[PDB]
Design a binder for this molecule. Structure first.
Ligand SMILES: CC(=O)SCCNC(=O)CCNC(=O)[C@H](O)C(C)(C)COP(=O)(O)OP(=O)(O)OC[C@H]1O[C@@H](n2cnc3c(N)ncnc32)[C@H](O)[C@@H]1OP(=O)(O)O
Lengths: 166, 277, 56
């Protein structure tokens, strides 16, 4: 999967967003076991606090959009993050929820990535959990050339393989 | 404390829904739909001042108007009404309640109110519970379930939804599925004691982040594992994860030693969890 | 005649089901299920001496 779809790396700084805490924590544990590096947000990127993210979301890395996150929140966060220069790779985790259905979220993410001027400067990785409900989403990711993985630990392992190779 | 009192939560004869709504995007709407589709043998009583009927079921304007005392109640409302609604429920005579949302500065008042009326509460910010053999689906989850012989206890909603979806893929079922939330009143050791005696359960799987009473947990697990196998996954082994989860206090080798001493076994990652299922 | 009076039949606000039952092969069971799945905006009231509740 990685050799087929992932864009070559220009660095080793990682950013993570999720619609839940525990998957992000599992990702962090896997990253720690392999001596990886987390990215640090800049003060100016605090446009996130203003940009319609509700007041109860804490602005840091990993960025935990809560269980009730909607697709619009994803799109706004993606735009703001892509217009910055604070990281070299971006991990996007999605868990099953009523507010953000899998197929629609995948479609909006694909379009947002397609239309962004600075998309070709970073490497995207997706991890959509839930075997039954994410089949069509994974198929759509495949046709657009974006890599996708089954579990967060696998995603971290795939990223660190290329980091170590370089 | 008393194992008497969990009967109302796990084998209720009637349920009341506070805040049921006709709006498709509301939490009360989803809970009402799930309960009606579950296959329950008792009545489902909606309570709300904004609708005369919900999904074809006659409604009642307030708690005091109910025709009799419900066994179990669910709050689907803003946190600012919690204490008043709880007091009304206590006056009516209900003994078990599920709470959707609450800040951390409310815990002491909630505990005092619950003690005053001899009521048990399932942790605030809880996803709910499912009991297929009773045809009961009192949860805010969008994933269906089927009957089985495996029981699962979780302190995380996302993991619960993920495991339910995996089970749906493989055509597999459960005997009990319980989400703890913040574990303010009901906790893991009592549920282990209860499940050790359930005739439909033959194995237990747990996902945990923190504990409050170590000796009771150790004793309950040791007693329960004499006749049924039990596996556990525990996250937060690194400083960044501990900061994210607000569990910086403690040490992980202590968890390793405690798990070993009670006769359990620890699994390492997500893949091993699916394989364990 | 009585063109007024068909409004209750064709645009009712509430319906009562006499003989509703929990047995899957009964007529009242089918009627209750169809009514509940219809998408009605009013209440559906079961009447029977043999069950405390029907389909919840
Ligand atoms: C653990 C999980 O993962 S759960 C699934 C994930 N979802 C979440 O975490 C989000 C949960 N939170 C929410 O859905 C929302 O933020 C809420 C429900 C907590 C708050 O929404 P609010 O608008 O603040 O709720 P509020 O209490 O004011 O009103 C809710 C309903 O109660 C009704 N209501 C108001 N007063 C009362 C009352 N005294 N008794 C009963 N119902 C009442 C209101 O009419 C409203 O119904 P309506 O919209 O049909 O008119």
């Amino acid at each position: 999967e990685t050799l087929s779809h992932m864009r070559p790396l220009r660095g080793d700084r990682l950013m993570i967003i999720s619609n839940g805490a525990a998957p992000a924590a599992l990702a962090l544990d896997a990253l720690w076991s392999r001596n990886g590096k987390l990215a640090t947000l800049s003060e100016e990127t605090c446009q996130k606090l203003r940009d319609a993210l509700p007041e109860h979301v804490a602005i840091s890395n990993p960025l935990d959009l809560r269980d009730d996150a909607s697709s619009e929140h994803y799109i706004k966060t993606l735009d703001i993050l892509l217009h910055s220069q604070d990281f070299d790779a971006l991990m996007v985790i999605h868990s099953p929820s009523a507010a953000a259905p899998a197929t629609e979220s995948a479609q909006v993410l694909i379009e947002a990535v397609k239309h962004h001027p600075r998309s070709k400067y970073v490497s995207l990785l997706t991890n959509w959990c839930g075997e039954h409900s994410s089949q069509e989403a994974r198929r759509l990711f495949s046709e657009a050339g974006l890599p996708t993985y089954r579990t967060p630990e696998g995603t971290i392992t795939a990223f660190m393989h290329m980091v170590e190779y370089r | 404390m008393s194992q008497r009192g969990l009967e109302a939560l796990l084998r209720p004869k009637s349920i009341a829904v506070i805040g049921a709504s006709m709006k498709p995007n509301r939490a009360g709407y989803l809970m009402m739909r799930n309960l009606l589709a579950g296959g329950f043998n008792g009545p489902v009583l909606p309570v709300t001042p904004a609708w005369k009927a919900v999904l074809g079921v006659l409604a009642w304007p307030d708690i005091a108007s109910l025709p009799f005392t419900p066994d179990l109640a669910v709050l689907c409302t803003n946190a600012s009404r919690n204490l008043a609604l709880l007091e009304e429920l206590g006056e009516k005579g209900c003994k078990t309640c599920i709470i959707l949302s609450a800040p951390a500065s409310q815990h002491e008042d909630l505990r005092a109110c619950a003690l005053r009326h001899n009521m048990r509460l399932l942790g605030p910010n809880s996803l709910g519970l499912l009991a297929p053999w009773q045809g009961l689906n009192a949860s805010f989850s969008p994933v269906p379930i089927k009957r089985g012989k495996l029981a699962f206890i979780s302190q995380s909603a996302a993991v619960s939804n993920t495991i339910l979806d995996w089970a749906q893929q493989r055509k597999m079922g459960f005997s009990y599925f319980i989400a703890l939330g913040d574990s303010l009143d009901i906790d893991v050791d009592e549920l282990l004691d209860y499940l050790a005696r359930d005739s439909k359960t033959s194995a237990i799987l747990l996902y945990l982040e923190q504990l409050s009473d170590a000796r009771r947990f150790v004793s309950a697990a040791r007693s329960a594992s004499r006749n049924k196998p039990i596996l556990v996954i525990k996250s937060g082994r690194s400083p960044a994860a501990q900061r994210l989860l607000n569990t910086t206090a403690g040490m992980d080798p202590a968890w390793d030693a405690a798990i070993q001493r009670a006769g359990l076994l620890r699994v390492q990652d997500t893949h091993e969890l699916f394989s364990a299922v």
